[PDB]
Amino acid sequence: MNPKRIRALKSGKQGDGPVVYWMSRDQRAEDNWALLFSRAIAKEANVPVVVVFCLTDEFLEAGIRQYEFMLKGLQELEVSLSRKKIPSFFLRGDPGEKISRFVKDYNAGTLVTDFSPLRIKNQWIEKVISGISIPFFEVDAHNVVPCWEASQKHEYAAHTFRPKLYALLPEFLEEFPELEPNSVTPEVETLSDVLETGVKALLPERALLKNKDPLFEPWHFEPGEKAAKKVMESFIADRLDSYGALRNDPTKNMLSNLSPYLHFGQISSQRVVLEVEKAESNPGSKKAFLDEILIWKEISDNFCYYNPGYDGFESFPSWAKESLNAHRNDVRSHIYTLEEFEAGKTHDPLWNASQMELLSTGKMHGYTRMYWAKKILEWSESPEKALEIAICLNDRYELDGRDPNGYAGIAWSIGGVHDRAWGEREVTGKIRYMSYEGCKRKFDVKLYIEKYS
Numbered sequence: 001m002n003p004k005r006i007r008a009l010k011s012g013k014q015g016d017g018p019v020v021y022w023m024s025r026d027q028r029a030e031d032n033w034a035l036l037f038s039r040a041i042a043k044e045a046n047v048p049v050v051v052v053f054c055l056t057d058e059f060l061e062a063g064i065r066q067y068e069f070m071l072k073g074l075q076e077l078e079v080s081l082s083r084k085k086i087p088s089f090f091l092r093g094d095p096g097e098k099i100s101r102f103v104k105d106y107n108a109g110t111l112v113t114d115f116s117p118l119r120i121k122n123q124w125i126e127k128v129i130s131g132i133s134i135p136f137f138e139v140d141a142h143n144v145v146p147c148w149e150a151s152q153k154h155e156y157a158a159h160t161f162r163p164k165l166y167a168l169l170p171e172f173l174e175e176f177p178e179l180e181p182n183s184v185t186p187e188v189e190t191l192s193d194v195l196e197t198g199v200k201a202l203l204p205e206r207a208l209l210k211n212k213d214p215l216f217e218p219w220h221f222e223p224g225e226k227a228a229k230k231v232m233e234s235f236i237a238d239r240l241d242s243y244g245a246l247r248n249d250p251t252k253n254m255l256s257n258l259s260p261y262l263h264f265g266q267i268s269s270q271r272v273v274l275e276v277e278k279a280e281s282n283p284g285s286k287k288a289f290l291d292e293i294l295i296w297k298e299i300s301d302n303f304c305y306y307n308p309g310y311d312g313f314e315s316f317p318s319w320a321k322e323s324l325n326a327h328r329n330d331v332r333s334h335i336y337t338l339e340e341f342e343a344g345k346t347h348d349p350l351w352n353a354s355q356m357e358l359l360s361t362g363k364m365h366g367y368t369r370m371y372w373a374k375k376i377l378e379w380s381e382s383p384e385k386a387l388e389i390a391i392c393l394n395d396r397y398e399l400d401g402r403d404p405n406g407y408a409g410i411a412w413s414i415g416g417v418h419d420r421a422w423g424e425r426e427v428t429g430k431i432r433y434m435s436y437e438g439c440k441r442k443f444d445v446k447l448y449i450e451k452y453s
């Protein structure tokens with residue numbers, strides 16, 4: 001077990017009660033460094049390990065599509081942890097109040113959590129630190145190389161982060177040890193009731209078309225750790241050979257479709273990398289997939305960890321801020337409101353089709369995301385307004401939303417983060433421009449519009 005994966009958040013006197021794993025980002029029982037580190041310390045202190053998940057008050061800022069995907073995976077995880085003699089406690093409310101009260105009520109000895117560089121997680125860390133007196137650790141279980149170890153600063157381009165991450169791969173890309181069960185079973189409601197009351201509270205804000213029927217189709221991605229692995233096996237067996245060639249064709253389903261499982265932590269990226277590396281296929285297709293799940297996935301965590309305002313105009317590069325400012329007064333061709341974007345009521349049928357895939361499936365194709373976001377910038381009153389519209393529609397309807405990949409992806413599309421300066425245009429400046437005719441020369445746009453009416 002590598003000590004560079006765990007970080008100390010607060011020193012304190014260890015209690016003689018169970019080590020608590022405050023699970024948040026990585027919702028799985030297998031291939032979880034944070035859960036394995038909790039079981040090791042619990043073994044050394046000769047005391048069982050317990051798992052606590054907090055159902056926050058912010059679930060109403062999303063939709064039913066994310067509430068059911070996360071909770072149905074939690075029902076499966078509870079059985080898996082119980083088979084390992086590990087009990088799960090699901091609290092509801094502010095984790096600054098619930099975790100602090102649980103630690104004192106159960107005589108907790110050590111508190112451990114998983115790593116997330118998002119602002120809402122740092123808000124929870126500051127609240128729980130002020131209300132505990134036991135040691136508090138955090139473990140990077142989402143990235144192969146720990147986020148604080150891959151780079152000590154913000155990396156402005158992928159060609160700089162790539163050699164730093166690959167040079168550390170032999171040290172941090174390793175097999176997972178088996179989760180040892182609790183020796184004996186130790187000493188706050190049913191998730192089915194929590195999922196019933198939450199969905200009832202989310203029903204008025206459900207996405208519907210004119211016929212009152214729902215828009216979201218929940219049969220595209222079954223949630224759970226078991227379904228997460230089955231999707232990864234299908235990608236390696238059927239789709240990985242053609243990934244490098246058909247990853248930029250929205251009309252082909254050649255992607256791995258692992259993002260909803262990777263967001264909620266139902267499958268480990270290090271596990272996906274291990275199976276892909278030991279699989280035999282096209283080396284151009286392998287290189288392309290590892291570049292997405294290693295370089296671009298972990299540079300998104302690097303962008304959120306080293307830029308406090310990762311969701312603001314101030315985190316853009318200087319060349320992009322100066323360029324967008326010099327075109328702030330350019331007469332926009334069109335200006336749509338948030339409601340026109342949300343309903344896909346723009347003049348562009350390709351953009352509207354890209355939005356309908358987002359509304360109906362909760363997972364828009366990877367290529368159309370850059371078109372969907374860069375057109376928001378072209379048809380917004382300001383770069384800041386486009387940032388708010390893109391983040392709102394991304395986090396509300398993407399099953400992988402509210403994720404560092406989404407903020408770094410939106411920053412790349414609108415602010416040129418991890419990009420370079422292109423030909424100067426009006427309105428958009430030097431930001432990389434993607435036209436409607438450029439998509440037609442790349443893939444059958446008519447087949448993609450006809451699919452998402």
Ligand SMILES: Cc1cc2nc3c(=O)[nH]c(=O)nc-3n(C[C@H](O)[C@H](O)[C@H](O)COP(=O)(O)OP(=O)(O)OC[C@H]3O[C@@H](n4cnc5c(N)ncnc54)[C@H](O)[C@@H]3O)c2cc1C
Nearest residue numbers: 255256257258259292293297366369373400401405406409
């Ligand atoms: C405007 C915009 C919005 C995005 N919104 C999200 C989002 O809300 N949530 C999210 O997790 N990703 C987002 N992405 C990144 C990317 O689109 C998705 O990761 C990818 O489409 C997920 O589907 P997939 O797993 O089938 O793709 P694959 O090609 O099979 O890639 C597999 C994994 O590699 C990672 N990956 C792939 N592409 C990217 C990328 N461009 N940036 C970062 N990581 C990547 C992802 O973890 C992905 O799950 C966004 C990108 C853009 C440009």
